[PDB]
């Protein structure tokens, strides 16, 4: 594990603690979210982020932050502001960026 892998594994653990239900743990499917893949061009989830760390696909903290923001932005695009997914996406986006300083 490279230094960047160890730091991103730390950040991901801290970010997932903010999603105790694991709403963001796995990819959203069109089966449970009608039209999701037609509205969201670039899906992201914490599970895919873990796999990218393990594969050493993140070469900067900026790239990891961009995937976290994408995951949150996707939830705030597909879902209405009154929904659990939208409200948690917004909360963890701000708290996560603050946490990662």
Ligand X SMILES: Cc1c(NCc2ccccc2N2CCN(C)CC2)cnn(C)c1=O
Q: Which is nearer to ligand X, 53 or 88 (CB)?
A: 88
Q: In whole angstroms, how far apart are CA 5 and each of 73, 95, 98?
A: 24, 21, 20
Q: What is the largest CA-CA distance in the chain?
A: 41
How many Cβ atoms from other residues are within 10 Å of residue 77's Cβ?
Answer: 12
Indicate whether 28 belongs to the interface with ligand X (CB under 6 A).
yes
Count of residues interacting with ligand X (CB under 6 A): 12
Between CA 67 and CA 76, with CA 72 as vertex, the angle to 5 degrees is 140
Q: Which is nearer to ligand X, 53 or 75 (CB)?
A: 75
Query: Can you tell me which of 4, 9, 23, 47 binds ligand X, judged by CB under 6 A?
Result: 23
- Please report, as residue ranges, which positions from 30 to 89 form the binding site for ligand X (by CB under 6 A): 32-33, 36, 75, 78-79, 85
Q: Which is nearer to ligand X, 16 or 79 (CB)?
A: 79
Backbone φ and ψ for 32, nearest 5 degrees, come out as -105, -10
Contact residues for ligand X, defined by CB under 6 A: 23-24, 26, 28-29, 32-33, 36, 75, 78-79, 85
């Amino acid at each position: 594990s490279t230094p960047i892998q160890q730091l991103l594994e730390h950040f991901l653990r801290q970010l997932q603690r903010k999603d105790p239900h694991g709403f963001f743990a796995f990819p959203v499917t069109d089966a449970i979210a009608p039209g999701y893949s037609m509205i969201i061009k670039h899906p992201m989830d914490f599970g895919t982020m873990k796999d990218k760390i393990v594969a050493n696909e993140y070469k900067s903290v900026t790239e990891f932050k961009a995937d976290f923001k994408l995951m949150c932005d996707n939830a705030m695009t597909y879902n209405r502001p009154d929904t659990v997914y939208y409200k948690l996406a917004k909360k963890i986006l701000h708290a996560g960026f603050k946490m990662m300083s």
